[PDB]
């Protein structure tokens, strides 16, 4: 949920978004180097780019872990495309060293033509929902992923999946935001992720987006969620 901002906070956020060397790097971790240019995609009315989203998804993983939440795994926003094009053999190494199935929640951010959306696969109840702040349906997407999960379980565990007990899902008509601006799709994908990784039911609305943006630039500068 929301909070207020300290004057110091407000200025630090102000300066990151303010003018300056676009390629100046303001925060580094997860091998990502967030630059002024990147963080500027959180200015109101702007579309978030992939650096902002991948950085945030990683903070969720660190947060969850430090606060005792469910084991979280997040795929790069480049995983799904490379799986769309080259099939499983093209991303089989992207889980090198990790046992997907020992995790509880997996998050897959998806970049659609011009808007962001997200998929949550819940390995605790073989569930798979597609959350799209633009109202869209994730059919191919969800099926294309469960299959990946199938292939991963065979190549890596040498056991097959029971795709039968694996049931899709698509957010109900009344959960889709009225305003409908692609501009905010990255914020919905991040916040949906935040809540869903916590089991906290989605209570926020589009009115909280501009505040959520300022909060998120501070959270990235300090690599800590509020």
């Amino acid at each position: 949920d929301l909070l207020e901002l300290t004057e110091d906070m407000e200025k630090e956020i102000s300066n990151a978004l303010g003018h300056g060397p676009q390629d100046e790097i303001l925060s580094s971790a997860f091998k990502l180097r967030i630059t002024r240019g990147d963080i500027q995609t959180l200015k109101n009315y702007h579309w978030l780019n992939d650096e902002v989203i991948n950085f945030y998804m990683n903070l969720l993983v660190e947060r969850n872990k430090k606060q005792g939440y469910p084991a979280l795994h997040v795929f790069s926003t480049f995983f799904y495309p490379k799986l769309k094009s080259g099939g499983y053999q093209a991303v089989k190494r992207w889980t090198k060293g990790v046992n997907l199935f020992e995790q509880e929640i997996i998050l897959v951010p998806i970049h659609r033509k011009v808007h962001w959306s997200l998929v949550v696969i819940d390995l605790r109840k073989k569930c798979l929902k597609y959350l799209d702040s633009m109202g869209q349906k994730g059919h191919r997407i969800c099926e294309i992923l469960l299959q990946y999960l199938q292939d991963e379980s065979k190549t890596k565990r040498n056991s097959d999946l029971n795709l039968l007990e694996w049931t899709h899902h698509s957010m109900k008509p009344h959960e889709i935001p009225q305003q409908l601006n692609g501009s905010d799709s990255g914020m919905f994908t991040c916040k949906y992720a935040d809540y869903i990784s916590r089991d906290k039911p989605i209570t926020f609305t589009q009115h909280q987006m501009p505040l959520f943006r300022k909060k998120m630039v501070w959270e990235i500068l300090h690599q800590q969620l509020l």
Binding site: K31, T35, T41, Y45, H46, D50, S76, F78, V91, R93
Partner: protein, 84 residues
């Protein structure tokens, strides 16, 4: 030792490279970027899904002969055009 690495573009393009296991990958990156004429700001290099930093070395990343590096385009979408 020398090692060969392949850089796959999102357009099916592939470019081979040859470098020493202890050479910063920054050379490979500016190289590719020049040859295909792209903006660094606009692209991302990844080795098995994980970013590659300019100081990383094929040795550190534990790369091997004929290993593949992926290159993707920035994912944005819209553009805000503020007036006045």
């Amino acid at each position: 030792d020398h090692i060969n690495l392949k850089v796959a573009g999102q357009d099916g393009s592939v470019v081979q490279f040859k470098i020493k296991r202890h050479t910063p990958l920054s050379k490979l990156m500016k190289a590719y970027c020049e040859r295909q004429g792209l903006s660094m700001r606009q692209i991302r290099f990844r080795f098995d899904g994980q970013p590659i930093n300019e100081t990383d070395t094929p040795a550190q990343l534990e790369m091997e002969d004929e290993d593949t590096i992926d290159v993707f385009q920035q994912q944005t979408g819209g553009v805000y055009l503020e007036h006045h």
